[PDB]
From Swiss-Prot:
This protein's name: Pentafunctional AROM polypeptide
Protein family: In the N-terminal section; belongs to the sugar phosphate cyclases superfamily. Dehydroquinate synthase family. In the 2nd section; belongs to the EPSP synthase family.
Subunit structure comment from the entry: Homodimer.
Described function: The AROM polypeptide catalyzes 5 consecutive enzymatic reactions in prechorismate polyaromatic amino acid biosynthesis.
Residues of the full protein shown: 857 to 987 of 1551
Domain of life, source organism: Eukaryota
Lineage: Eukaryota, Fungi, Dikarya, Ascomycota, Saccharomycotina
Cellular localisation: Cytoplasm
Residues at which ATP binds: G9, M10, R11, G12, T13, G14, K15, S16
Amino acid sequence: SDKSIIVIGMRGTGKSTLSEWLASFLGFKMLDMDKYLEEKLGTGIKSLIKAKGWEYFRQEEAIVAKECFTKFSKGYVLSTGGGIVEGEDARQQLKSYADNGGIVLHLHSEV
């Protein structure tokens, strides 16, 4: 119960609300897996994909997704991104949270 809720799903104009509205309900904190990126390098989110590509944007995402699932385990409702499940190994570390007893959760033309 006191554990996190890993919210997978898409990105909308109101899908960032239910990530923090879930944080505000349980008295739990919130850590987005998108806005965590710009303070450790100092550069923007969209400035990293247009400069190198999808590869090292994923490799930077894959390393930082490990520790916040275990040292930010008890308390932050970890709002994960939209293209996280695009790769194979990020699909598998999500499934590691399932059988241990986690509450991994999905919140349901170009779009």
